[PDB]
Amino acid sequence: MIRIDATPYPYQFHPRSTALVVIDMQRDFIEEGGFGSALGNDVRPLAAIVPTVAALLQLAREAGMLVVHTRESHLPDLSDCPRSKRLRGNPTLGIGDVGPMGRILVQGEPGNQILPQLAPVEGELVIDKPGKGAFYATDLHAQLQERRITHLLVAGVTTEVSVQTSMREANDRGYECLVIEDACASYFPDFHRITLEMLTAQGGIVGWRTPLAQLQAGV
Amino acid sequence: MIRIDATPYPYQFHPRSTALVVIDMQRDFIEEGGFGSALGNDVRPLAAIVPTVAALLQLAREAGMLVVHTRESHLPDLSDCPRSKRLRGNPTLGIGDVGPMGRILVQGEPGNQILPQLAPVEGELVIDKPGKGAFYATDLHAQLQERRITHLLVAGVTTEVSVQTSMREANDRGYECLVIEDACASYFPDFHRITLEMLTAQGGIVGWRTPLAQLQAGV
């Protein structure tokens, strides 16, 4: 079992009982021409972690861990998109409308694809999720139980939305979760660090956090 | 049909399709010597909201809305308590250990009870949940769908753990959620404030928030 330095105390895991979960690293959220920048978000902090996420993905692949990618996406007919989600924020361009990289948040559109630097390969799970939490309305929990996974390494975007939602759901379902702090990012510096602090408060209420360099030291 | 001034924009609901959800207002969180104290917290800040939660409960009862209470709790044999949750951190006492109000976080124990001043009455729904999120491993989604509930008024403790986890689950499931800002509290004032900001960021990404006085004005 590999033991690495973490907050709030060291985290130990066996690589073959562990999955890396890379959350929502999608072109529309991260690329300068994309829908995220069009809404006036500063995508630079999300772009900034891509080399770190790629290094974590390489570590996981070399260590023989299960790799799980998630995409926030809906069926082209929006049959899995609740009306509340479509109407939220009174948007000019909403879910299913044509944005700069195709229909917004729709399966098969260029904007919906994982960045090519972090693209899934054969033997990796890819989860299309209709919400922020990777476990809601997906078979992720079943797929991890079939593979006897107990431990999750968590990366991706954005820290305070899909990453924290997915880690809080994983914690509730009995997973031991380690969030890789420099392999996550937010549009808001107001939210990134304090989220990671929340997750590991009270002796690890949701789980653990560490930088990629501490994980690399262990393998 | 009832329109409330709220952040990030006004919230509209109908009592016939709205529930009040009161989260984890238990002696295990609010009274010294239970689960919250066992985690090393000073539980004293949560008591300050109990009169505001009581006024919110009265308002919902007088409006004839469905009321849902949640209790974080485990079966006495701990068969619904993941090993990860039991072994997390270094608590003074662990789940199921005997504290001054009985077995910590166990169903039927004095310290696990909802505060008498906030107790359920005949015709309210009471959800025992094994995780922080009110939807995981409960029938809450089915119970609301059977009553055609679309809107949730949300209150309780703690803001950054059970409240925000439950609200994020409810958002993913298509509910429209209004958190009553002064009917929530945290052990950590900064986590309370920033959680409320995250929930309504980006045009209402999780939902809405407003103080009790704005709700009272609308009814």
Residue numbers in the entry:
A (entry chain A), B (entry chain B): 1 to 219
The authors write:
However, the inactive mutant C162S was able to produce large cocrystals with biuret. The cocrystal containing biuret, at a concentration of 30 mM biuret, only occupied one of four active sites in the unit cell. Biuret is coordinated by a subset of the residues that coordinate triuret, and it binds in a noncatalytic fashion. The dihedral angle for biuret is fairly planar in this structure and binds in the same place where triuret is planar as well. The closed conformation is observed in all of the chains of the triuret cocrystal as well as for a single chain in the biuret cocrystal, which has biuret bound. The other chains in the biuret cocrystal that do not have biuret bound, as well as the apo WT crystal, are in the open conformation. Biuret shows very low activity and is a very weak inhibitor of TrtA. Inhibition data suggests that biuret is a competitive inhibitor. The biuret cocrystallized with TrtA binding in a noncatalytic fashion suggesting that the glutamine residue has a strong role in binding the substrate and stabilizing the preattack conformation as biuret is fairly planar in this structure.
